Amino acid sequence: DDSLGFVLIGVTAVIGLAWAQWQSYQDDGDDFFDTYDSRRAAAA
Amino acid sequence: MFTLKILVYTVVIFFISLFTFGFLSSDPSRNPNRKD
Amino acid sequence: EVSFGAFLAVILGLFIPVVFLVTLYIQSEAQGTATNFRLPDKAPGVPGDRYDA
Amino acid sequence: GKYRRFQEMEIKHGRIAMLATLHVFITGTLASWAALPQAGWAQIVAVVAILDNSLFAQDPNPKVKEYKLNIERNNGRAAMMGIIGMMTHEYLTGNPLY
Amino acid sequence: MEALVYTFLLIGTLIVIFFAIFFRDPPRIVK
Amino acid sequence: ESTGFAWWSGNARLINVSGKLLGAHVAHAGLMVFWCGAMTLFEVAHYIPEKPLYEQGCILIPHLTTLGWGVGPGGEVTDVYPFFVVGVLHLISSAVLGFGGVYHSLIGPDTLEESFPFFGYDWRDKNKMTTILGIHLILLGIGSFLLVAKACFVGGLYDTWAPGGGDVRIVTAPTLNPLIIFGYVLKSPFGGDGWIISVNNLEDLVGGHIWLGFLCVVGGIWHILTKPFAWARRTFVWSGEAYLSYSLAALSVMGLTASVFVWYNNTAYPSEFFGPTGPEASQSQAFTFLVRDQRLGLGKYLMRSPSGEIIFGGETMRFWDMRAPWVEPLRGPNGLDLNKIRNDIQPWQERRAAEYMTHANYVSPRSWLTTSHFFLGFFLWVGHLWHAGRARAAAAGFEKGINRENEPVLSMRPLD
Amino acid sequence: ALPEPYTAFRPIVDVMPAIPVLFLLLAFVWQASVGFR
Amino acid sequence: ESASFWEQFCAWITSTENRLYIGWFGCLMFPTLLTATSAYIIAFIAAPPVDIDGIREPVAGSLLYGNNIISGAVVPSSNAIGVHFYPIWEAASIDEWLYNGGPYQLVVFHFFIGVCAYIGREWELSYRLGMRPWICVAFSAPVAAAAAVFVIYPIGQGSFSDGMPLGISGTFNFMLVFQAEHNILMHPFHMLGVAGVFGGSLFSAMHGSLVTSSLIRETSENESLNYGYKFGQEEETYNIVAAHGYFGRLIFQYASFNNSRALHFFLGAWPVVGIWFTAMGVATMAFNLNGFNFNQSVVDSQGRVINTWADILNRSNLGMEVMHERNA
Numbered sequence A: 001d002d003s004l005g006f007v008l009i010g011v012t013a014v015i016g017l018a019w020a021q022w023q024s025y026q027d028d029g030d031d032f033f034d035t036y037d038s039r040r041a042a043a044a
Numbered sequence B: 001m002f003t004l005k006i007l008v009y010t011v012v013i014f015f016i017s018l019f020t021f022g023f024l025s026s027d028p029s030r031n032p033n034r035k036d
Numbered sequence C: 001e002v003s004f005g006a007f008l009a010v011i012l013g014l015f016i017p018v019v020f021l022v023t024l025y026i027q028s029e030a031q032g033t034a035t036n037f038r039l040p041d042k043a044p045g046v047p048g049d050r051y052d053a
Numbered sequence D: 001g002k003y004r005r006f007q008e009m010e011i012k013h014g015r016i017a018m019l020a021t022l023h024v025f026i027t028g029t030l031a032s033w034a035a036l037p038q039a040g041w042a043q044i045v046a047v048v049a050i051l052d053n054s055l056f057a058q059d060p061n062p063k064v065k066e067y068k069l070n071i072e073r074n075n076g077r078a079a080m081m082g083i084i085g086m087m088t089h090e091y092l093t094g095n096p097l098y
Numbered sequence E: 001m002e003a004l005v006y007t008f009l010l011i012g013t014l015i016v017i018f019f020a021i022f023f024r025d026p027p028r029i030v031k
Numbered sequence F: 001e002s003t004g005f006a007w008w009s010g011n012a013r014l015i016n017v018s019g020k021l022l023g024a025h026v027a028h029a030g031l032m033v034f035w036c037g038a039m040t041l042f043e044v045a046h047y048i049p050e051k052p053l054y055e056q057g058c059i060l061i062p063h064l065t066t067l068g069w070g071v072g073p074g075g076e077v078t079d080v081y082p083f084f085v086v087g088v089l090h091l092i093s094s095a096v097l098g099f100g101g102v103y104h105s106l107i108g109p110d111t112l113e114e115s116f117p118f119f120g121y122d123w124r125d126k127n128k129m130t131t132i133l134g135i136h137l138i139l140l141g142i143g144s145f146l147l148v149a150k151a152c153f154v155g156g157l158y159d160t161w162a163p164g165g166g167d168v169r170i171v172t173a174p175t176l177n178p179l180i181i182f183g184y185v186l187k188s189p190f191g192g193d194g195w196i197i198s199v200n201n202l203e204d205l206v207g208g209h210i211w212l213g214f215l216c217v218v219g220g221i222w223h224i225l226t227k228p229f230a231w232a233r234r235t236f237v238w239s240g241e242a243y244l245s246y247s248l249a250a251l252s253v254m255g256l257t258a259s260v261f262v263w264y265n266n267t268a269y270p271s272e273f274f275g276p277t278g279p280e281a282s283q284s285q286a287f288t289f290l291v292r293d294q295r296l297g298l299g300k301y302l303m304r305s306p307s308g309e310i311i312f313g314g315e316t317m318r319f320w321d322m323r324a325p326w327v328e329p330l331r332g333p334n335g336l337d338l339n340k341i342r343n344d345i346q347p348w349q350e351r352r353a354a355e356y357m358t359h360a361n362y363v364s365p366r367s368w369l370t371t372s373h374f375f376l377g378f379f380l381w382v383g384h385l386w387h388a389g390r391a392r393a394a395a396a397g398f399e400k401g402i403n404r405e406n407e408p409v410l411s412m413r414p415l416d
Numbered sequence G: 001a002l003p004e005p006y007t008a009f010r011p012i013v014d015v016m017p018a019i020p021v022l023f024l025l026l027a028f029v030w031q032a033s034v035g036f037r
Numbered sequence H: 001e002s003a004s005f006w007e008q009f010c011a012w013i014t015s016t017e018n019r020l021y022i023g024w025f026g027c028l029m030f031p032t033l034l035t036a037t038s039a040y041i042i043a044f045i046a047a048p049p050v051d052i053d054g055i056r057e058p059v060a061g062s063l064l065y066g067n068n069i070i071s072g073a074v075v076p077s078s079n080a081i082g083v084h085f086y087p088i089w090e091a092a093s094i095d096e097w098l099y100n101g102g103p104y105q106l107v108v109f110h111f112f113i114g115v116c117a118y119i120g121r122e123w124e125l126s127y128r129l130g131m132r133p134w135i136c137v138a139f140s141a142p143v144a145a146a147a148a149v150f151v152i153y154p155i156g157q158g159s160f161s162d163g164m165p166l167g168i169s170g171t172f173n174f175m176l177v178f179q180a181e182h183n184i185l186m187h188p189f190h191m192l193g194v195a196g197v198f199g200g201s202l203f204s205a206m207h208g209s210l211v212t213s214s215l216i217r218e219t220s221e222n223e224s225l226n227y228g229y230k231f232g233q234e235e236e237t238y239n240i241v242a243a244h245g246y247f248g249r250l251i252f253q254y255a256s257f258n259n260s261r262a263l264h265f266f267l268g269a270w271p272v273v274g275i276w277f278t279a280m281g282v283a284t285m286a287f288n289l290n291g292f293n294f295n296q297s298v299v300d301s302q303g304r305v306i307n308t309w310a311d312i313l314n315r316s317n318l319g320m321e322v323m324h325e326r327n328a
């Protein structure tokens, strides 16, 4: 609001928690040997 | 107006964060030649 | 000064060919020839089958 | 799963809080936070980050030592409680009110 | 009066574009 | 053929051949050093002592006078010998680099992964690529520290903002406050405040290079000692063409930035060796005309800005953000102070603006540098687009074309 | 201009800039010599 | 076990079943391009005159203020602004924002972001469909030209007032002033651009006439031949050898691009490279690297100047320049 950085911090937090919720059930802990990661855990 | 500046700032940051976190959401996997 | 004849030139120059195109398309829909996704004519006056049956 | 996160969270939060207590005890908090140049604080934050992720990063996978860690865990709990109040005593009183 | 005609022509062009995009002939693949 | 690449794309045959890739890169580096040394040798061979550097098409000698080599007070060029030894050193280093690149490309160890596991690499081995990136980041930070050593300990840097007309000044108090240093980076890029270009003194320059060297050093050891995290591993493409595309995007950004930098900034590129900027020359014309009109015996030559700023009128009013070392002594709190104009105008400022009047068939070296590096930056952005697309499509596996047996579009439901 | 002990090296200096660009034409004639393999 | 909201959002955004593909680049493209579209339409229909020159003489550009579609434009920002960032919240009033050419800045910035995101979106859909990703490289040439005409020339000249107006007559005025100040006609890069555009039209008409000429008979008499092609068919719709023989006999014995791959690469490459070079020519002329100057190139024995066609072109440039430099 006042210093205009809370608008920046607040919005990327809200979308960031949505992204973190998606990232939580991604089994990306194991490392792959490939050009790109084809592993995407789609719940539904 | 300061309120218009606030609304434009949060809309711009919202769309930019949508772009940024969307491209971080395993974008190279979203291709038709994905190895199952 | 509003040019009186210029208004008719814009109006009738737009309305009449738009009318001609709309009338041609509507009667084409009645004959089942208003799609390009159909086979060529199997016979003179008989339109071809559509791609999706 | 949450216990594994909480276990390493408690010991490492304590371990940082121990070294903070020995710092303010041998130097006799927020006064040193402002007196130090911000290049030095960025220098400190950098070397902790390399240590926390590379050289002192935990791999995910005798009666004297099992009590010593419990002593360390108990002394870490006290050092954690003291530090957050020590800054407040510098915030209001300015000096640790003996 | 002229500006009304100009606005009507431009808006009608955009309407034609909208109809050409969203109410187009659906492409069917020959079988 | 064996790799499928034709002769016109024959350097693509070196993607999986690390030894010849190293040879090609070292040979290209030798070519770069050869051009650098040969160009400064060419520039000193054609250098006329009486003329300024920007009047004889010099681009590499002005880069040396900025570093405080062979330059006197006021921007005068004293000795050509330091530029000569710089050229000779670059020639000899170029010979060494060319020999090394030719050896590694022709008779060196082809596919050196097996022979030298420390030097060998695979594009998908993220640990090894992060190690290489960290080593080169450490080298870049060391180079920035070398510039700081030049600025603060060895000789010094030419300070165009020094009183009296500029002099080579050794800086002893760099701006180490991260608020100012990183507010330069987070500055808006529009008029008034010009992002990084708006650096107007030597102190912020050397302090920012200290911060950059420290950041590059710590990032280098970070990338050497760590591995990319899960989000980074799932986001990027791990292949040589992808890394080339990322470097192309970064290099394009830097090329456009340096083009605007040499066009606008007169601190890292002083107007004594590179010549005046466009706004600098326009305000020079206005200022010299005002000097003539005041010496003849508000005025139409100046105007009152809405922000209470006294600035030159006419078409020159769009360049009211221009700051020059010969305007700042006459510029006070509200801008161009009327009292300061006709009271203490020193004669060194009078000749400088009159000199910048004529350099408003002539192409300034600022124009050459700006246009050339802008051309290169844009085409490197185009190359980033090409190589990024090709890397992503080759990683996914359809860079050769659409498979006839399994066409992806035929498996999707109709759009409408 | 060029320093006095190296003033005799004036003519070789003018052709020094053109060596990097002619390396590019060397790659074209090398491929033309082998018939663009 | 339920799917997270972000997973459904990512599935819908990158869905290939949408009527218009959105994608992550479209998340930037659609709001910016819809912002610039509505703002352009409103400013074109009704907007008070903009004092572009900075000396209290405004230029009318809207339909409601007495100009038609041809003369209507979104006038560039004022000379007082220069290259300053001028959002709607940094003006004292909406009237002062409209008086200084703020709509131009808003529309231009949103449009530039939108076309860069359009390039990215073209790559994105090429990736989701499994095709080769170089259509975006082809679109990078008109985007570069728009960037040079709207952003980069104001950067070099130091004012957004020197950008191209968003109108027809404003575009012509920009062209005339640019020719007066830089002689773009004699610039080699504009010659490459004209060669690219003329050659692109030539090659488009040539290829189209060659394919249309050799269409294989599949329809009846006077029926449209376009029904002879079936969407999704595998067999070729035209006789390639007959068209190649015609093109070979037209100029010289073996001149037909027998491989259609390099023919289509040439078709895609020629106007793209030409537009790239004319964009870079316009961008380099922003920093006063003007075109060829062949003025007073012919003199007689006594020193008198014999004019050439370049001198007549220079006289035209001088006339436009003295009518543009309003009290320089």
Ligand code: CLA
Binding pocket: F007, F008, F009, F010, F011, F012, F244, F248, F379, F380, F381, F382, F383, F384, F386, F387, F390, G021, G024
């Ligand atoms: C550091 C930059 C860099 C690097 C390492 C690469 C690397 C590669 N590229 Mg990429 N590229 C770049 C920048 C780069 N490129 C830029 C800036 C563009 C935009 C123009 C491209 C666009 C591009 C395309 C379109 C292609 C590549 C391809 C390739 C591969 C083969 C290149 C080759 O064999 O050269 C051969 C070199 C030539 C034939 C030179 C041609 C003549 C040039 C244009 C002259 C330029 C004028 C010069 C400045 C002055 C000369 C004047 C006079 C003497 C003639 C190789 C992996 C090819 C590949 O197949 O993909 C992997 C491919 O098709 N690149």
Ligand code: CLA
Binding pocket: F006, F007, F008, F009, F010, F011, F012, F013, F014, F020, F021, F023, F024, F025, F027, F028, F095, F096, F098, F099, F102, F105, F106, G024, G027, G028, G030, G031
């Ligand atoms: C910066 C320029 C550059 C560099 C360093 C390279 C590097 C390389 N290329 Mg590329 N190339 C380039 C530009 C370059 N290329 C351009 C513009 C084109 C388009 C024409 C190509 C087309 C191309 C193809 C089609 C192929 C290569 C191949 C190769 C590799 C093997 C070359 C070879 O076998 O030489 C043999 C050369 C000779 C026998 C004659 C030249 C002898 C020397 C090198 C001449 C220079 C001598 C020098 C002046 C000596 C100074 C020494 C002194 C300082 C001590 C090598 C790593 C090959 C490959 O990719 O892998 C095998 C390959 O098939 N290149």
Ligand code: KC1
Binding pocket: D081, D082, D084, D085, D086, D088, D089, D092, D093, D097
């Ligand atoms: C266990 C170690 C310990 C001791 C021994 C101790 C002692 C005193 N605290 Mg402290 N303190 C903490 C720890 C300790 N405090 C912690 C963990 C916190 C964070 C929750 C904390 C916060 C505050 C705040 C906000 C205030 C505060 C005060 C006093 C003051 C009371 C005066 C009295 O005893 O009559 C005495 C000296 C007040 C003050 O400063 O003076 C009025 C005050 O306002 N404290």
Ligand SMILES: CC1=C(/C=C/C(C)=C/C=C/C(C)=C/C=C/C=C(C)/C=C/C=C(C)/C=C/C2=C(C)CCCC2(C)C)C(C)(C)CCC1
Binding pocket: F027, F028, F030, F031, F034, F088, F091, F092, F094, F095, F096, F097, F098, F099, F101, F102, F105, F106, G006, G009, G012, G023, G026, G027, G030
């Ligand atoms: C692989 C290959 C390649 C590459 C290579 C290269 C590119 C190389 C480089 C090279 C180089 C890079 C070189 C260098 C050289 C140098 C030299 C050889 C030097 C010398 C010097 C001198 C001699 C000097 C002297 C002087 C002085 C000291 C002073 C002044 C005067 C003078 C200048 C004289 C190519 C492509 C071709 C082909 C294919 C293969």
Ligand SMILES: CC1=C(/C=C/C(C)=C/C=C/C(C)=C/C=C/C=C(C)/C=C/C=C(C)/C=C/C2=C(C)CCCC2(C)C)C(C)(C)CCC1
Binding pocket: B019, B020, B021, B023, B024, F180, F181, F182, F184, F185, F196, F199, F204, F205, F206, F207, F208, F209, F211, F212, F235
């Ligand atoms: C020297 C100097 C200086 C400087 C310094 C510094 C401090 C710097 C910094 C710098 C920096 C600090 C930089 C940064 C940068 C960053 C960037 C450039 C980023 C980018 C990003 C990216 C690239 C990403 C992307 C993405 C996304 C967004 C999403 C997902 C996907 C991806 C990942 C791709 C100054 C000016 C002061 C002064 C003068 C001197």
Ligand SMILES: [Fe+2]
Binding pocket: H211
């Ligand atoms: Fe075709």
